[PDB]
C-alpha cells in the first residue's frame, strides 16, 4: 500500500518533489518531527544526502522512505484522522483564541514572586489530537508551573499502580457542598476528593510507598515523561522553595490529616508535604501539557508514541473527578455549560479534554476571584458554543454547532 | 439500480419470491416493531395485499414508502448493528438483578405500598427506535421523580435557559435554597415546584396538565401515558414537606409574579401522578439520547438546548445522596423515582427504564442500581470511557413525591 | 409599743398631728404609687375619713391607726428603706438622664411588614420599671399600648412550664442556642426547634397550651395568666394586628407544615388551628408600664410585686430566665449577654422586656429597630444601665468598679 | 464602751474569766477558717510566742489584736455562710452520693492521664470569705489542662483590656469543627483556637520561661499562695501528640490571626506548658473563689484581677464551660463552670463561693461524671442557680440566711 500513496500524492506526474510530500504530511496536522515518523524522516534526510535527483522520489524511493510507517501515513493521508479536515479546525482555534485574547481582566496569582512576575498579556493555547495532529497559537512555549493542574495527573498515577479500591479508601469520590469548602475532611474523617487540597495530600502520600522524595521525584517525572510524549517536562526549585515556605494552610491540612490519621501506616507527613510542593512546582509548556491532556483523552495511550501510560480504570476515574471537581468554586457552571473535564491552576492553566477527539491546554496569568484563567474559561465557553464537544451534545442532532470529526 | 430491488435480493437469498413471515421475522431480528409509527406505510401496504409469498414488484409497492430505514435496518447501519447479541446480553443482566431480593417499597402512601416486590422490568429503545423488553414492562406506574427532568426539558424548550436559570439553580447541593435565595437544581423538591410554577403560565391547571401530557405524548412516540388520579389525592394529602417548601418559596419570592403557589402545588403533585410503563418511559429516555428527537416517529419534541441542560442535571443530581457514586461508577444521565423506576439514557445510543418497587435506603431501586452498575461492567457506555480503548468490555456498536 | 403607733411618730417628727398631703408624698418617695393593690384598704380608709372628719384635712394619731392598720406591714418597710432600692428617688433621677441620652440616639428603622407595626412613630419611646417591692417610676411615652410580637415568647413558655413542667415541655423542644450555622434551620438534630425563644419553638409551645379546648377558651385561659403577671393591669388585643399577621405569615406556615412533617406535636394537633393561636398570642396588647410588670413578676421568683400573687412556679420563672439570657435577642444574644448580662426579650414592635433578678422588671419601647430586629433605644439603654449599675450577672456584690449599687443607701 | 477584742473575748469566755487556747481554736474552725489563713498569721504567731494554756483578757486581746476585724466577723456570724458546719456537712451528703457514680472513662490519649485511679475524687469548697472545706482526694496534683482557659484569658484581659483581646478572639458560643468564625476569629477564648490566641496575647516581646514565670507568679496570687507547680512529662507527651493544636495554629497563621511578630510554634509550646501546670482541689477551689469573689483573693485580701477581667470571665464559662454539655449545664446547673480533661471542674458560685472538684473518668462529651453529677446535685439542694431568686424559692435551701 506504498504503491497506493505514491499514487494519490503524485497527482499522476511520474515522481513526487520531497517538498510536497511533506507539505501534504503536515497539512494533515502531524509534525515532520513525531515520534511514530522517525523511521521515515530519517529515510527521507539519507535519501536526501544519496540521491542523484535533486529532491525527486520516484515510485520506488518512496517506497523506500514511506514504508516502515505505511500504516500511520495512510491514515493520515486518507483523512481517518479523528478531525479529518485539521486545517479548517485550527483555523477556527485560531479565532476563539483572538476573540480572548480581547478579554483583558484578572489578577495574576502573587501569593508568591514565582507567579507574581508573570505577564498579564501571555495567552497560549495548544491542541494534541487523539491522533497525534497538533497545533498551537499564543504563548505555547513558555515554561510554568502545572500547580493544581498536577493534581488529576498524580491521582491517575495512583490508580494505576493501586487501582481504584486501595486509593478511594483514602480519599472520596464526590464534590464537597458549595458550603463544605472549606471543610478538610468528610463525615467518614475522609478528604472529599483528590482534586481538592487535602485529598491531594493524601494522593501524594500513596504513590510509590517505601523509597525517599528523590525516588518519589524521579519516578513521578518518567511518568509524566510519557504521558507528555518526551516533551518538556521540568522542575522549578524557585517556585517549590517558595511554596514550602509560605504553605501555611497546607500544613495545617497535614497535622490535621495526620489528627484523623488519614494517611498509610508508616507515613512521615512533613516528607510528604515536601514531595506535594515539588509536584506542585513542576514545569510545562503549552505544547508538552496539551499531549498530557490527549494522553487522558485516549485511553491511556500517549497519541504521539502509541505507548500505554495509564490504565483505562486510571484515565476513567480521572476525567470523572475532573468534571465534577476540577475547577474549583466553579465547577458546576463549568459542567453545565462546558461540559468538559477540565482542571484549572493557579499559574492560569486549564487542562482540558475532550474524550476521543483532543487534549488541550490553555494558559494565561490573569485570574478571576474564583481562582480560574480569565482568558482560558472564555475561550472554554466559545470552544462548546462553536463545535459540538459539550458532554450531552447529540452526535447525530446538533444544532447549529459545527462537528469537525465529520468533515498552591 | 433500484434501491427497493437491491434489498429485495438481499432478503431473497437469491430465491424467486420472500414469503411475508420470512420478511417480517428479519425486520424483527434488526430490534425493530411490526408496529413501529415509521413503518406504519409497509404495514398497511402489507394488510391489503394479504388481504402469503410476495415477489419483485409485490414487495416494492409494500416497501417502497418506507425504503430507507428498511435499507437502514437491513445494511446494518443501526446504532446496535448486532440487536439480537446485545438483547441476550440485557436478558443475562435482568435475570441477575432479579434474584437481588433487597430493598424496601415505599409505603408513605397505599398506592405505593400495594406493588409486589416482585415485579422487575427493563425495556430499551435504541435512537434508532430498536426494542427489547424483559420482564414487567407493561404494568403502568407512577412517575414520581422521574417526571423532574422531563418537565424541565419543557420549561426550557419552552422559556430557554436564561429564563429557567433565573428562578432555579443548576448544580448538586436539607436547605430548600441555595445562597441566591433559588432552589440548588431543578432535580430536588424545591426546584422541581418553581419549575412547575414556569410552565404555560396565565392559563388554568386543568389546561396545563393538557399541555404536559400532549408533550409527554410525543415523548413516548404515543405510547402509555395516563394518570392516577387516587396518588393524586394521597400525594396532595400527605405532603407536608411539599407544602413547608411552596409556602418558603412563596415567602422568598422565588416564585414568578402572578402565581397561585397552593395552585402549583396541585399541578406539582398531579404530574408526581402521571402513569408510565417501562416500555413508554424506554422512549421517553430515548428521546433525551437521540438530541430531543423521538427515534420511534422521527419528530423533533424537545431542542437540543433542552435536552444537553436536562442530561447536565440527571448526571450530578439525579440519584438522590448517590448520586455523586452513581456518576463515578455509572457515569450514565439517570433519574430515579419513589415508585421504584430509574430512568436512564445512554447519550447516542438508547434510552431505558428500569422498575422494581423495593428501594434501597437511599430511596433507590434495588435491582434497578443492580442493573446499572452491571451494564457498566459489561459494556463501554460509561460516559468517560473510552471508544478505541477499552478493557475486558465489550462496545454493541461494533460488530464483534 | 404599736407598729401603727410607731410609723406615726417617725412620719410626725413630733407635730401632734399629720396632714393627709405629707403622708402621701412621703408615702409617693418610696415609690409606691397610691393605686397600688397592697395600698387599697388604707386608701379607701383615708377617703372615707376625709368625707368624715371634723378636724379634715389633718391626722390624729388614732385616725392614723385606723387608716394604717390594714396595710401597716407594707407600708412599715416602704417608710424604713427595706425595700429593694431604698433611694428611689436618686434612683428613678438616673433612670431619667439615661432616657434622655437613648432618646437622642435617632437610627433605625420602624418594621412595616405589615401596615400595624409601620405606622408607628419613630420617635414613641418609653421606659417603665417595676421594682421587685412593687415601687414604680416611667418615662417618655408608656402609656401607649403596642403588641407583645417575640416579647411574648418567654411568658407563653413559661405558662407552659408552669402547667406541664420541664420535663414534658422540653420533650418537644430543645433548651440551647440555635448558633450562626444553623440560625435558618427550623428543627436540630433530634428534630426539636432549637429553643422557645425562636419562632419553630414558640410554635411548638403554643400547641402544648391548654390541649383539648378550643382556641377562643386556650385565648382566655392565657390572657387571664397575662392580667395576673402585670398585676391586672392593661392587657389587651389587636384585632387588626392579627389579621395582617395571619395573612403574611407564609414562613410561619412553612413552618408550621415542616413541623407536622416531623411529628413535632402532640397527638391531636390540629397545625392551622395552633397557626391561629400563635397570630393572636402575638397580636396581645401592652403597655410600658403594664409589661413592666410582667417583667417585675419574673424578677421576684413568679408572685407579682404589685398584688402578692403567686403566678408561676419558680421552676417555670427560672427556665424563662436561662432562655432569654442565652436566646433573647435574635442574632445579638451573644453580644448583649456578655456586655449586659440580664435576661432579656426583644420584639418586633420595638419592645425589649428586661429583668434584673431580685430587683426589678422593666419595659423599653421605641419602635426603630437595628440590622438584628432590636430597638436601637433600648439597646443604647440596656448598656448605660449596665454601665452605670452593677447590675449584670456577673457584675459582683462586694466589688465592682466605679459602679454605683440602687440597693445601697450608699412575626 | 468596751473594746473589740474586749467585747469578743467576754463573748468567747462565756461567763469564766480565763478562755483555753485550744476552746479559741476549735471555736475559730468552727466557722470555717483554718488556722494557716495569711490573714490570721499575726495572731497564730501571737499565740506562737505566748504559749510557746489558758489566756486571759490581756493576753487574748494581745494576740487577736490585729487581725481583730476579720475575727468578729467570722464570731458574730457575718460571713457569706453563718452556719458553715452544716453547709460542709450538706456537702459531704453530696459527695458521698456523687462517690457511687462509678461510671465513665479515664483520658488515655496521653500516659499521664491514663495513670490515674479512676475511684480518685474531691471537692474542695472555698468561700469568698475564706471559710475552706474539703471532702476526699483534695491534695492530689493533677494538670488543670483546659481548666486554666478562664485563668489566662483573666490574665489577659487584666493586663490589656477587652477591647484589644477580643479584637484577636470572639465572645460566643459556636456545636462547630471549625477553627474561625465567619470574622475570621477564633470563636471564644474557651475553645482550643481561641485559647492559642489568648496564649500569643499574654506578656508579648519576652521569652517563654518569662512568659511561664509571669503566669505562674499570677496563678500563685490567685491560689493566695497555695500548691501551684508544674508536670514536665505531661508537658512533653501533651506536645509529641497535639497534632490537632498544631493544625490549628498553622491555620490561625495562614489566617493572620495572632498578633505581628508571633512566633506561632513558640506559642503552641507556651500552651502545651499551661495545660500541664498543676493543682489540687484545695488550691484550685482557692482560684475559683478568687473569681467568686471579684478579683480578690479571700485568703490574702489581694487585688489579683480587675473586675472587667473576672466579670468576662464568668460570662465566658456560662455559655462555652463545659464543652458539648455547656447550654446543658447553663440551663440546669445555671453556674460559671469550666472543665478539664483530667476530670477537674471548676465552679464559681458568684458572690459565694468557688469550688474544684476533680475525678479522672469522663463522660462521652468529656466532663467528670462524678463532678457533674456533684454539680446537678448541689444546685437542686440550695439555690446556688443564676435564675434563682433570693426572696422565694421552693423547698430549696439558702445557706446565706441562718437556718489538651
Ligand atoms: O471558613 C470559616 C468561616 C469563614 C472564614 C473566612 C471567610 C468566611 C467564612 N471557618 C473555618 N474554620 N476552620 C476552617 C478549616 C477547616 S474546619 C477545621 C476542622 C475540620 N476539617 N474538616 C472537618 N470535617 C468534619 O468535621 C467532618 C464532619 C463533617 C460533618 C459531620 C461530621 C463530621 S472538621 S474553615
Ligand atoms: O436537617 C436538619 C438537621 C437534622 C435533621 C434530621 C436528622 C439530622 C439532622 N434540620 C432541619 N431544620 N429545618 C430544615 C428545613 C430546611 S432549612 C429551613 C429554612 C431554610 N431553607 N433553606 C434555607 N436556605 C438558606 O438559608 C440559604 C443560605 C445558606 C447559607 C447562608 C445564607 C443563606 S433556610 S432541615
Redesign the interface.
Known amino acids: 500500500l506504498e504503491d497506493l500513496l505514491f499514487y494519490t500524492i503524485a497527482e499522476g506526474q511520474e515522481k513526487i518533489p520531497v517538498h510536497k510530500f511533506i507539505t501534504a504530511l503536515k497539512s494533515t496536522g502531524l509534525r515532520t518531527s513525531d515520534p511514530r515518523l522517525k523511521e521515515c524522516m530519517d529515510m527521507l534526510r539519507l535519501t536526501l544526502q544519496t540521491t542523484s535527483d535533486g529532491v525527486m522520489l520516484d515510485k520506488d524511493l518512496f517506497k523506500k522512505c514511506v514504508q516502515s510507517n505505511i500504516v500511520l501515513l495512510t491514515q493520515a493521508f486518507r483523512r481517518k484522522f479523528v478531525i479529518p479536515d485539521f486545517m479548517s479546525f485550527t483555523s477556527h482555534i485560531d479565532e476563539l483564541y483572538e476573540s480572548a485574547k480581547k478579554q483583558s481582566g484578572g489578577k495574576v496569582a502573587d501569593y508568591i514572586p514565582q507567579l507574581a512576575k508573570f505577564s498579564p498579556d501571555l495567552w497560549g493555547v495548544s491542541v494534541c489530537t487523539?491522533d497525534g495532529q497538533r497545533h498551537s497559537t499564543g504563548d505555547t512555549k513558555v515554561p510554568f508551573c502545572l500547580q493544581s493542574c498536577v493534581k488529576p495527573l498524580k491521582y491517575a498515577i495512583a490508580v494505576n499502580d493501586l487501582g481504584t479500591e486501595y486509593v478511594h479508601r483514602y480519599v472520596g469520590?464526590?464534590?464537597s457542598?458549595?458550603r463544605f469548602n472549606?471543610l478538610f475532611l468528610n463525615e467518614d474523617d475522609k478528604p472529599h476528593n483528590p482534586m481538592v487540597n487535602a485529598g491531594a495530600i493524601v494522593v501524594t502520600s500513596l504513590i510509590k510507598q517505601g523509597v525517599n522524595n528523590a525516588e518519589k521525584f524521579d519516578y513521578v517525572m518518567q511518568f509524566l515523561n510519557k504521558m507528555a510524549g518526551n516533551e518538556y517536562v521540568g522542575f522549578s526549585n524557585a517556585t517549590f522553595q517558595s511554596e514550602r515556605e509560605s504553605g501555611?494552610?497546607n500544613?495545617?491540612?497535614?497535622?490535621?490529616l495526620?489528627?484523623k490519621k488519614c494517611f498509610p501506616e508508616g507515613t512521615d507527613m512533613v516528607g510528604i508535604l515536601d514531595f506535594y510542593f515539588q509536584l506542585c512546582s513542576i514545569e510545562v509548556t503549552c505544547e508538552s501539557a496539551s499531549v498530557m491532556a490527549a494522553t487522558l483523552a485516549?485511553?491511556?495511550?500517549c497519541p504521539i508514541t502509541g505507548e500505554r501510560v495509564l490504565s483505562?480504570?486510571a484515565?476513567?476515574?480521572t476525567?470523572?473527578?475532573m468534571?465534577?471537581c476540577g475547577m474549583y468554586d466553579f465547577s458546576?457552571?463549568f459542567?453545565?455549560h462546558v461540559?468538559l473535564?477540565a482542571k484549572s491552576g493557579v499559574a492560569g492553566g486549564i487542562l482540558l479534554v475532550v474524550?476521543?477527539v483532543m487534549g488541550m491546554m490553555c494558559w494565561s496569568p490573569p485570574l478571576d476571584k474564583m481562582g480560574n484563567s480569565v482568558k482560558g474559561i472564555h475561550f472554554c465557553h466559545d470552544l462548546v458554543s462553536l463545535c459540538n464537544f459539550?458532554?450531552?451534545?447529540?452526535?447525530?442532532?446538533?444544532?447549529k454547532?459545527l462537528d469537525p470529526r465529520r468533515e498552591e
Open positions: 487523539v469520590k464526590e464534590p457542598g458549595l472549606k501555611d494552610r500544613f495545617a491540612i497535614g497535622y490535621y495526620k489528627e485516549n485511553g491511556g495511550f483505562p480504570e484515565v476513567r476515574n476525567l470523572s473527578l468534571h465534577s458546576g457552571q459542567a453545565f461540559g473535564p474524550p476521543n459539550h458532554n450531552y451534545d447529540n452526535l447525530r442532532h446538533f444544532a454547532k
